[PDB]
RNA sequence: UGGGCUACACACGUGCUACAAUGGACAAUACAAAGGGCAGCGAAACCGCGAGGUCAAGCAAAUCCCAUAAAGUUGUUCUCAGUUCGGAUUGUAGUCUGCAACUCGACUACAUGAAGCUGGAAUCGCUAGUAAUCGUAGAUCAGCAUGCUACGGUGAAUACGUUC
């Protein structure tokens, strides 16, 4: 368990770390590099001391709720300031200027024919 | 412009109008066609009537709105 | 009984000084800690309650009492006498051990912990805490539990008012959201 | 307590590896590792990633700095 | 001057990318064609995680530059799941073009990680260097291409036959 999240034991640590929010493959490589913990060794086979070292590095990066909270706050601010992007967030329509005549399903949700 | 090396883009005519208002104790409504001009920190507390293409829509700058173009806040299209 | 020792020594002094208690007996104490789990899902599947019971038994360290519905409700698909919950009442030494572990280990383990609510008092000096998941408790392993389920922990205090109870819990070292 | 209706309960030492915090309290959890304690006995040891002292809220330590204000970020971004 | 042609409960056409192991990632290592270029193509070197920037050689062309093709080949690792498949969406910080990227550009980094488990009725193209697949170039062009028009690499299956 690292950063309040239990990464899969079976998977290699490098991939396992990606499961933590705010950690991607790039960061997962970097956090292992700083920890000096090999990517190859699997989480189940990871030594206890190694696990602690990983945790220290992961703690240094913003992860889980702290990053989640920040992201939400930015979206909230846009809605608060009544920015065009914010308005589109409120509408649930493509915010970054993707055409809405066709497609736009992920933002708009399922087809209501 | 967008690039960091270039300073934040603001139209001179809009900027100069704000500059005069800075000195004044009480700010006045500004008519601006400059949708493209960025909202500067100085702009805070100033009301700008940004053109939506058919009419000028009132916009009041706040701290949060800084770093966003004046044009963003005004809506050019109407739906329902 | 490290938490009890604190209560016996420093905590007693703090409360009696703070509220100008005439007698030592007046000083508030936690009468009981009761852990409530609701398994309305047990109606749908008998196994769910049994699994919860197992989890509660481990966390509490004593066998839970199955709780049955007082009345039948159609909306909840509830029938009177059906088993829908498990409860444990911790008293004496076991209570102090449970509370110290909760504050020391389990509450820290809570994801994105911002402290416990300060307003969660009935107005009679009794506090209720709701845990979102039972994974926070150390005994339970993530593999063992099939489904995460919340629990309610009720701290019943001899304190007349919430404020007295709040001071007792704060002296105990309970995290407060503030 | 009724005999044989309760799960086995024994004193165990809880250790925070991060902050090197040890305390002895009873738990159903059994650990192969055991350590000598202040009391003249040996108790099984449970290892915790996070404890009261470890968790930031209890200490009040802030892991990350607060986000810059909109005016502030504008100034910092373009060095004005 | 500013907005719109970029609207969005939906329906349809033509495409693009996937739904993994005939694969994903990583490392090493080969083999083309056809084109563009003067204030334009811009090498090399330095700097940047990268997009780029800085400086600057050659080159109005079988000379120099775009521009190292890619698939491939040989290892290494993952191990059958919504994943080390997929990459939509959104946040943040950037780069570049342009007077100016708000409405409404391209690209990068980091994080986030949708639907999708091979598709009802129905329906399309193709007889060989073709289909399929893999990259390459050009026009337009400040910037902007999953489009269009060109180019090669690898490279099939089957055609009894004319009742329908
Ligand atoms: Mg058109």
UniProtKB/Swiss-Prot annotation, chain A:
Q: How does it assemble?
A: Part of the 30S ribosomal subunit. Forms a loose heterodimer with protein S19. Forms two bridges to the 50S subunit in the 70S ribosome.
- Which Gene3D superfamilies does the record associate with it? 1.10.8.50, 30s ribosomal protein s13, domain 2 (4.10.910.10)
Record GO terms (molecular function): rRNA binding; structural constituent of ribosome; tRNA binding
- Source species, domain of life: Bacteria
Which named protein is this? Small ribosomal subunit protein uS13
Job description of the protein: Located at the top of the head of the 30S subunit, it contacts several helices of the 16S rRNA. In the 70S ribosome it contacts the 23S rRNA (bridge B1a) and protein L5 of the 50S subunit (bridge B1b), connecting the 2 subunits; these bridges are implicated in subunit movement. Contacts the tRNAs in the A and P-sites.
Q: Which UniProt keywords apply?
A: Ribonucleoprotein, Ribosomal protein, RNA-binding, rRNA-binding, tRNA-binding
InterPro entries, alphabetized: Rbsml_uS13_C, Ribosomal_uS13, Ribosomal_uS13-like_H2TH, Ribosomal_uS13_bac-type, Ribosomal_uS13_CS
Question: Could you tell me which residues belong to the region Disordered?
Answer: 89-113
Tell me yes or no: is Ribonucleoprotein among this UniProt entry's keywords.
yes
Record family assignment: Belongs to the universal ribosomal protein uS13 family.
From Swiss-Prot, chain B:
Q: Keyword Thylakoid, does the record have it?
A: no
GO biological process terms, alphabetically, are:
ribosomal small subunit assembly; translation
- One GO MF term attached to the UniProt entry: structural constituent of ribosome
Q: Which InterPro entries match?
A: Ribosomal_uS19 (IPR002222), Ribosomal_uS19_bac-type (IPR005732), Ribosomal_uS19_CS (IPR020934), Ribosomal_uS19_SF (IPR023575)
Q: Which GO terms describe its cellular component?
A: cytoplasm; small ribosomal subunit
> What family does the database annotate?
Belongs to the universal ribosomal protein uS19 family.
In terms of PANTHER family, this protein maps to:
RIBOSOMAL PROTEIN S19P FAMILY MEMBER, SMALL RIBOSOMAL SUBUNIT PROTEIN US19M
The role this protein plays is: Protein S19 forms a complex with S13 that binds strongly to the 16S ribosomal RNA.
Query: What is the recorded name of this protein?
Result: Small ribosomal subunit protein uS19
What is the scientific name of the source organism? Staphylococcus aureus (strain NCTC 8325 / PS 47)
> What are the top taxonomic ranks of the organism?
Bacteria, Bacillati, Bacillota, Bacilli, Bacillales
Curated annotation (Swiss-Prot), chain C:
A GO term from the CC aspect: cytosolic large ribosomal subunit
Q: Does the keyword tRNA processing apply?
A: no
Against PROSITE patterns, the record matches this protein to: RIBOSOMAL_L5
InterPro entries hit by this protein = Ribosomal_uL5 (IPR002132), Ribosomal_uL5_bac-type (IPR020930), Ribosomal_uL5_C (IPR031309), Ribosomal_uL5_CS (IPR020929), Ribosomal_uL5_dom_sf (IPR022803), Ribosomal_uL5_N (IPR031310)
Superkingdom field: Bacteria
Which GO terms label this protein's molecular function in UniProt? Answer: RNA binding; rRNA binding; structural constituent of ribosome; tRNA binding
GO biological process annotations for this chain's record?
translation
One Pfam match: Ribosomal_L5
Record's Gene3D superfamilies? 3.30.1440.10
Q: Which UniProt keywords apply?
A: Ribonucleoprotein, Ribosomal protein, RNA-binding, rRNA-binding, tRNA-binding
Family assignment? Belongs to the universal ribosomal protein uL5 family.
Tell me, what does this protein do in biology?
This is one of the proteins that bind and probably mediate the attachment of the 5S RNA into the large ribosomal subunit, where it forms part of the central protuberance. In the 70S ribosome it contacts protein S13 of the 30S subunit (bridge B1b), connecting the 2 subunits; this bridge is implicated in subunit movement. Contacts the P site tRNA; the 5S rRNA and some of its associated proteins might help stabilize positioning of ribosome-bound tRNAs.
The cross-references to HAMAP family, in alphabetical order and at most eight, read: Ribosomal_uL5_B
Subunit comment: Part of the 50S ribosomal subunit; part of the 5S rRNA/L5/L18/L25 subcomplex. Contacts the 5S rRNA and the P site tRNA. Forms a bridge to the 30S subunit in the 70S ribosome.
Record protein name field:
Large ribosomal subunit protein uL5
Supply the gene name.
rplE
Curated annotation (Swiss-Prot), chain D:
**UniProt keyword annotation of Isomerase present:** no
Specify the superkingdom: Bacteria
- UniProt entry tagged with the keyword Transmembrane helix: no
Molecular function per GO: structural constituent of ribosome
Which cysteine pairs are joined by S-S bonds?
none
* GO biological process, any: translation
GO cellular component terms, semicolon-separated = ribonucleoprotein complex; ribosome
Alphabetic keyword roster: Ribonucleoprotein, Ribosomal protein
Q: Which PANTHER family match?
A: 50S RIBOSOMAL PROTEIN L31, CHLOROPLASTIC, LARGE RIBOSOMAL SUBUNIT PROTEIN BL31C
SUBUNIT field: Part of the 50S ribosomal subunit.
Q: Which family does it belong to?
A: Belongs to the bacterial ribosomal protein bL31 family. Type B subfamily.
Name used for this protein in its record = Large ribosomal subunit protein bL31B
């Amino acid at each position: 368990r690292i950063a309040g999240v239990d990464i899969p034991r079976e998977k290699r640590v490098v991939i396992s770390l990606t499961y933590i929010y705010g950690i991607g493959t790039s960061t997962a490589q970097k956090i292992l590099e700083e920890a000096n913990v090999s990517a190859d060794t699997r989480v189940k086979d990871l030594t206890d001391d190694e696990l602690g070292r990983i945790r220290e590095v992961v703690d240094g990066y913003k992860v889980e709720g702290d990053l989640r909270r920040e992201t939400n706050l930015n979206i909230k601010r846009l809605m608060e300031i009544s920015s065009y992007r914010g308005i589109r967030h409120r509408r649930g329509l493509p915010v970054r200027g993707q055409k809405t005549k066709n497609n736009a399903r992920t933002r708009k949700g399922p087809v209501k024919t | 412009a967008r690039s960091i090396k270039k300073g934040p883009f603001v139209d001179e005519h809009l900027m100069k109008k704000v500059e005069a208002q800075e000195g004044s104790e009480k700010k006045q409504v500004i008519k601006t066609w400059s949708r493209r001009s960025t909202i500067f920190p100085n702009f805070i507390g100033h009301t700008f009537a940004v053109y939506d293409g058919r009419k000028h829509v009132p916009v009041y700058v706040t701290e949060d709105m800084v770093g966003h173009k004046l044009g963003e806040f005004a809506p050019t299209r109407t739906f329902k | 009984n490290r938490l009890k020792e604190k209560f016996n020594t420093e905590v007693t002094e703090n409360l009696m000084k703070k509220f100008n208690y005439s007698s030592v007996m007046e000083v508030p104490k936690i009468d009981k800690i009761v852990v409530n789990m609701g398994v309305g899902d047990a109606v749908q599947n008998s196994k769910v309650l049994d699994n919860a019971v197992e989890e509660l038994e481990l966390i509490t360290g004593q066998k839970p009492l199955v709780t049955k519905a007082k009345k039948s409700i159609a909306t909840f698909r509830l029938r009177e006498g059906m088993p829908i919950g498990a409860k444990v009442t911790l008293r004496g030494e076991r209570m102090y051990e449970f509370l110290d572990k909760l504050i020391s280990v389990s509450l820290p383990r809570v994801r994105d912990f911002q402290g416990v609510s300060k307003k969660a008092f009935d107005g009679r000096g009794n506090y209720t805490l709701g845990v979102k998941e039972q994974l926070i408790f150390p005994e339970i392993d993530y593999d063992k539990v099939s489904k995460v389920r919340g629990m309610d922990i009720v701290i019943v205090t001899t304190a007349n008012t919430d404020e007295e109870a709040r001071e007792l819990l704060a002296n105990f070292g309970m995290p407060f959201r503030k | 307590m009724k005999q044989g209706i309760h799960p086995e309960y024994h004193q165990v030492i809880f250790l925070d590896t991060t902050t090197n915090f040890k305390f002895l309290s009873g738990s159903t959890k059994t650990s192969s590792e055991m350590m000598e304690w202040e009391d003249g006995k040996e108790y099984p040891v449970i290892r915790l990633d996070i404890s009261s002292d470890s968790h930031p809220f209890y200490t009040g330590r802030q892991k990350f700095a607060a986000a810059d204000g909109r005016v502030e970020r504008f100034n910092k971004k373009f060095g004005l």
